[PDB]
Amino acid sequence: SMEEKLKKTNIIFVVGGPGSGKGTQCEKIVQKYGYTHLSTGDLLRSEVSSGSARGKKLSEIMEKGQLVPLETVLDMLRDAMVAKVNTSKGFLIDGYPREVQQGEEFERRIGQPTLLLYVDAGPETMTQRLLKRGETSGRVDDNEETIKKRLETYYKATEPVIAFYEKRGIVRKVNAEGSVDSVFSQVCTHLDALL
Numbered sequence: 196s197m198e199e200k201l202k203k204t205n206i207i208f209v210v211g212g213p214g215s216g217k218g219t220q221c222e223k224i225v226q227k228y229g230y231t232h233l234s235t236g237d238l239l240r241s242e243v244s245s246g247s248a249r250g251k252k253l254s255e256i257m258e259k260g261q262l263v264p265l266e267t268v269l270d271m272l273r274d275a276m277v278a279k280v281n282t283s284k285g286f287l288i289d290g291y292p293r294e295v296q297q298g299e300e301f302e303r304r305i306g307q308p309t310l311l312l313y314v315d316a317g318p319e320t321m322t323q324r325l326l327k328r329g330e331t332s333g334r335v336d337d338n339e340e341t342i343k344k345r346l347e348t349y350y351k352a353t354e355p356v357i358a359f360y361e362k363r364g365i366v367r368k369v370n371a372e373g374s375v376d377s378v379f380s381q382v383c384t385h386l387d388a389l390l
């Protein structure tokens with residue numbers, strides 16, 4: 196089973212706000228440590244690209260800055276894991292869990308996290324990076340009004356996730372401000388402590 200195989204492979208939740216640099220940092224973790232980077236947003240956007248009726252409904256939700264329903268995103272993530280479970284040296288789950296129920300369901304049905312890497316940026320920094328990214332086409336959810344809704348959703352639903360895992364004792368926090376290299380230096384100090 197999935198649950199059985201995953202007991203021998205580390206799972207790291209990587210959680211931060213929109214434009215926190217979480218994805219950027221996950222790609223550097225892959226380069227250095229050779230974990231599997233799975234992004235729920237990337238999975239959802241591929242389904243938009245497919246032009247399915249579901250992709251249509253997903254673009255509407257993402258373009259409003261809201262959370263896709265839990266079962267839809269958890270099933271896609273699960274499939275992505277099954278596809279790599281026999282070769283993976285470890286999983287970086289980027290952008291899930293984004294609400295407390297998402298963590299509960301994942302742990303009940305898939306597996307338990309070793310670590311939550313909290314990429315902690317301020318909202319002014321987040322807004323700057325997303326407005327900058329929005330100067331090129333490709334992410335229509337970088338619309339300035341959608342940036343605001345994404346930040347609101349993050350503080351309402353996603354910050355409570357950090358506090359939950361903090362109590363459990365698995366949170367390692369990095370200051371997400373500064374250069375990519377300076378943020379990654381912190382990430383490495385924490386990962387090198389365990390890995």
Ligand SMILES: Nc1ncnc2c1ncn2[C@@H]1O[C@H](COP(=O)(O)OP(=O)(O)OP(=O)(O)OP(=O)(O)OC[C@H]2O[C@@H](n3cnc4c(N)ncnc43)[C@H](O)[C@@H]2O)[C@@H](O)[C@H]1O
Pocket residue numbers: 212213214215216217218219220234235236237239256257258260261262263264268289290291292293297324325327328345371372373374375378
């Ligand atoms: N679990 C879930 N449940 C329900 N719905 C879900 C879900 N997961 C996703 N969704 C849906 O999908 C949507 C999109 O989510 P995501 O795919 O996670 O997109 P995001 O919040 O923009 O983060 P992303 O990883 O792309 O960007 P990053 O912070 O790396 O920042 C990248 C930008 O910052 C720049 N940057 C990075 N580090 C920098 C640094 N140190 N200095 C300057 N710029 C930096 C980069 O160059 C780049 O421009 C959600 O809003 C939601 O609707």
